[PDB]
């Protein structure tokens, strides 16, 4: 087939951090067609900062009389 007897398995052990780079290559402009659901997955996760910020400062003035 070819003047060398090729080697699929050589690669397979020094592919590896190349394997890595291969899907993270791939990923790159998929990332744009993402970004968009990327808002609807954080919708449900660490959305709520707002809510958050005026019970972490009503808590601290509570938590520092501590009476329980």
Same mark, same amino acid.
């Given at each position: 087939?070819?003047? =060398?007897?090729?080697?699929?398995? #050589?690669?397979?052990?020094?592919?590896?951090?190349?394997?890595?780079?291969?899907?993270? /290559?791939?990923?790159?402009?998929?990332?744009?067609?993402?970004?968009?659901?990327?808002? /609807?997955?954080?919708?449900?996760?660490? =959305?709520?900062?707002?809510? #958050?910020?005026?019970?972490?400062?009503?808590?601290?003035?509570?938590?520092?009389?501590?009476?329980?």
């Amino acid at each position: 087939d070819q003047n =060398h007897i090729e080697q699929p398995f #050589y690669l397979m052990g020094r592919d590896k951090a190349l394997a890595v780079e291969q899907f993270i /290559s791939r990923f790159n402009s998929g990332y744009i067609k993402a970004s968009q659901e990327l808002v /609807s997955y954080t919708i449900k996760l660490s =959305h709520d900062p707002i809510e #958050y910020l005026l019970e972490q400062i009503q808590n601290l003035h509570r938590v520092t009389l501590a009476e329980g």
